[PDB]
């Protein structure tokens, strides 16, 4: 019938795309990075420990000034930290205690949070009245909020557990654009450095590259074997990395349009929950459910270091814009800043 | 003290005043007991939460606060979420207990409930959370087994080889067929409960009618036992 013919045509297109991708695989990344010096052993020591939250820390986001930070914990609280002095600048109670995401506006005036309430709440930090006040509530999604990322003071992209991303207009509170490609819960999204594209990984072992200005998927990358929990853009914006339930991270390229390197080991059998790149883009920081964090050489795929300082599963991981420190949160209600030693 | 400016000390004072309110919030956080309500379309959990919040005073999560013997329970019922529970059931990994409602009078969808219970029991993050198992619609089950063409043997073949134990202790006036069916259904869940428990994990199976008043007391007693075993575990007693 019609459905069978359409399915056969889809399989033919899959074969064509696979052959086109295979034709351009001149050599592997590991062969190209086979004479450079290994990174060594990245020994990172803890500098600050922040001990405010009472329950599982589910997300965090650094400030663009590289000094302030935000953190959400499922007791229903959102705390802004001064990392240098471990002071508490703001402590915001939330209407719903089931929060899965955080954001810090690049301007610094607003914060955002969402979760099992299917609503993204935007709070205005710099109020003439001396408070922190709920600026807006965006209530379009029909599933839990997994991630959110500011574009400017009036734009934000959200991903929900209903196979949908959305670009909003904060002033009007209405969805400007909707991205409806995934077939599983979208778990994360990372904005491009120029904020003209982004990527979304979902619970179907596929990542998709969306165009914010026109709202259509550009490319799809399917290399993983299980649900993807994390994603992050390469510093130059021409690649990204993904972590999934299988104990493998993967590096994908947007120009070659295929996977480049796999970061895995036999001893690791848990799932990755958070990935990030260093400022130069050579270290991949992956948080695991074995209470640890692994510093991989993004080239050569060698494992360079371990950040073992948490008593429970690591949920959120971020890197300072200066590239000076790494903030790791965990389910033991503690958040730790890590820095190198000369 | 020294090397701190005039504003750099007022910042510390504001941080300490924030910690004061955090310490006050910790107390009210510790006082209440958080429960997770779970069920299916035909469970009847809506009826029990309505009739239990009334007498014991498109959102993604519904909250119900009640109080028994001056202790506070906060129960969470999921709603307006989708059909895949892999990634939102990890939020409720530190709740006091999982209330699980099963429609007993539905033989067609009883293995579905059994598989749901198995997946909940064996989950890595819910591996240490006790379950209060309510088996609703005992009246409908009673009239279903008392006389009719429906038989439990067509779906569970081992019912015909099942006899109620010596220590049955049935409710007065119950037909032996009804009570045999009741303990067969309860054993179907207790088998899974005891197959992989290994401590820190206990199922509490109850038989609930449509409108039963003593449903808050059942949960109160079950939570008492749960917390008591936590205290015993922390002291290496049992």
């Amino acid at each position: 019938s019609e459905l069978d013919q359409l399915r056969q045509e889809a399989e033919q297109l899959k074969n064509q795309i696979r052959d086109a991708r295979k034709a351009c695989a001149d050599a592997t990344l590991s062969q190209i990075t086979n004479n450079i010096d290994p990174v060594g052993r990245i020994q990172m020591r803890t500098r600050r420990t922040l001990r405010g939250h009472l329950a599982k820390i589910y997300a965090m986001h650094w400030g663009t000034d590289s000094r302030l930070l935000v953190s959400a914990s499922q007791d229903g609280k959102l705390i802004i930290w001064d990392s240098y002095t471990t002071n508490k600048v703001h402590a915001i109670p939330l209407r719903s205690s089931w929060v899965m995401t955080c954001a810090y506006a690049p301007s610094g005036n607003y914060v955002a949070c969402g979760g099992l309430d299917n609503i993204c709440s935007i709070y205005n930090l710099k109020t003439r009245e001396g408070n922190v006040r709920v600026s807006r509530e965006l209530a379009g999604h029909t599933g839990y909020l997994s991630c959110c990322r500011f574009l400017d003071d009036n734009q934000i992209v959200t991903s929900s557990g209903d196979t949908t991303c959305a670009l909003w207009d904060i002033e009007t509170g209405q969805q400007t654009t909707t991205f409806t490609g995934h077939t599983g819960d979208v778990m994360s999204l990372s904005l491009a450095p120029d904020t003209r594209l982004f990527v979304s990984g979902a619970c179907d072992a596929s990542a998709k590259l969306w165009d914010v200005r026109e709202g259509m998927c550009r490319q799809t990358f399917t290399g993983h074997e299980s649900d993807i929990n994390a994603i992050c853009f390469f510093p130059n914006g021409n690649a990204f990395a993904t972590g999934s339930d299988d104990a493998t991270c993967r590096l994908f390229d947007l120009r070659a349009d295929q996977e480049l390197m796999t970061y895995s080991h036999d001893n690791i059998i848990c799932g990755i929950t958070s990935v990030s790149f260093s400022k130069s883009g050579r270290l991949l920081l992956a948080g695991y459910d074995d209470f640890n964090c692994n510093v991989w050489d993004a080239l050569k795929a060698d494992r360079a270091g371990v950040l073992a300082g948490h008593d429970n599963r690591v949920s959120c991981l971020g890197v300072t814009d200066d590239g000076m420190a790494v903030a790791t949160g965990s389910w033991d209600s503690f958040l730790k800043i890590w820095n190198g030693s000369s | 003290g020294c090397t701190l400016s005039a504003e750099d000390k007022a910042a510390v004072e504001r941080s300490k005043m924030i910690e004061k309110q955090l310490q006050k919030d910790k107390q009210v956080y510790r006082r209440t007991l958080r429960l997770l309500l779970l069920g299916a379309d035909n469970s009847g959990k809506s009826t029990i939460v309505k009739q239990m919040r009334i007498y014991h005073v498109t959102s993604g999560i519904f909250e119900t606060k009640f109080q028994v013997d001056k202790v506070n329970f906060h129960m969470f019922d999921v709603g307006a979420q989708r059909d895949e529970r892999r990634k939102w059931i990890q939020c409720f990994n530190d709740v006091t207990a999982i209330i699980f409602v099963v429609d007993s009078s539905d033989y067609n969808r009883l293995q579905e409930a059994l598989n749901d219970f198995k997946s909940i029991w064996n989950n890595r993050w819910l591996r240490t959370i006790s379950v209060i198992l309510f088996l609703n619609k005992q009246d409908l089950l009673a009239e279903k087994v008392l006389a009719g063409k429906s038989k439990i043997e067509d779906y569970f073949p081992e019912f015909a080889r099942y006899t109620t134990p010596e220590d049955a202790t049935p409710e007065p006036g119950e037909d032996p067929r009804v009570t045999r069916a009741k303990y067969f259904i309860r054993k179907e869940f207790v088998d899974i409960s005891t197959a992989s428990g290994d401590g820190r994990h206990i199922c509490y199976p109850h038989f609930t009618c449509s409108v039963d008043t003593e449903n808050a007391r059942r949960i109160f007693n079950d939570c008492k036992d749960i917390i008591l075993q936590m205290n015993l575990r922390e002291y290496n007693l049992v």
Partner: single-chain antibody, 235 residues
Framework: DVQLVESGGGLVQPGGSRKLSCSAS????????MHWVRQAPEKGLEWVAY????????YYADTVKGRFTISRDDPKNTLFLQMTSLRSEDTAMYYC??????????????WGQGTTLTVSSGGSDIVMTQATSSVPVTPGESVSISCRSS???????????LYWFLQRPGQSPQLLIY???NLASGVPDRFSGSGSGTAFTLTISRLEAEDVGVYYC?????????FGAGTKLEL
């Protein structure tokens, strides 16, 4: 919106007692440290007292220490100054001032309205000098006001604590610049502040006719907050 209203002023005989009150409406009164600052009839601003956000830290000027007392009623949103043994030098206009302190806050942003008081019949202070006490200006031309202290205002944080205020004729002072370079909200981009440790400069580029008034220079580096003499810009 935000409003601070002062009351309790009048005429008192020497050696008496008098209480001033500052009622706050339109903002979270309990999150702001509060100052009482008095300005003599024609002799510039002068800090008097300070009480903290939780009323845990209290500071008095050595001129009023032992006589005045600052208190705070948070549920009723009121700030009190009780003055005992009023001298003849305590006649002045009193202002009640907010100050919120965190990493990037703007202390001294909003000043009260001020209440007048008329009475009939030191060792370690950062002295701040504003040598130019009168400048003739015309609209459309840039103006520069210079300030200079004794001790350097640059701390190990990298923060220089200098505040530029503007008092218009018949109006309460207004914060223009905090920490010597930042621009307070609502201030036109014409104003700029640039200083190096001890010498500071306020620059106005497109001077209008609404900028005539007295400019004051304050330090928040130490506890006895000190003001400058005050530079007057007139047409």
């Amino acid at each position: 919106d935000v409003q601070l209203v002062e009351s309790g002023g009048g005429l008192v005989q020497p050696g008496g007692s008098r209480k001033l009150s500052c009622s706050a409406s339109g903002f979270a009164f309990s999150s702001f440290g509060m100052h009482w600052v008095r300005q003599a009839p024609e002799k510039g601003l002068e800090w008097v007292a300070y009480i903290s956000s939780g009323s845990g830290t209290i500071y008095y000027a050595d001129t009023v220490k032992g006589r005045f007392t600052i208190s705070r009623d948070d549920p009723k949103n009121t700030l009190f100054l009780q003055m005992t043994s009023l001298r003849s030098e305590d006649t002045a206009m009193y202002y009640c001032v907010r100050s919120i302190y965190y990493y990037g806050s703007s202390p001294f942003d909003f000043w009260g309205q001020g209440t007048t008081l008329t009475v009939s019949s030191g060792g370690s202070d950062i002295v701040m000098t504003q040598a130019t006490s009168s400048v003739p200006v015309t609209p459309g031309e840039s103006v520069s006001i210079s300030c200079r202290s004794s001790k350097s205002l640059l701390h190990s944080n990298g923060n220089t604590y200098l505040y530029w205020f503007l008092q218009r004729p018949g109006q309460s002072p207004q914060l223009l610049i905090y920490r010597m370079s930042n621009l307070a909200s609502g201030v036109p981009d014409r104003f700029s502040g640039s200083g190096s440790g001890t010498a500071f400069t306020l620059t106005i580029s497109r001077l209008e006719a609404e900028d005539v008034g007295v400019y004051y220079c304050m330090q928040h580096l130490e506890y006895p907050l000190t003001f400058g003499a005050g530079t007057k810009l007139e047409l």
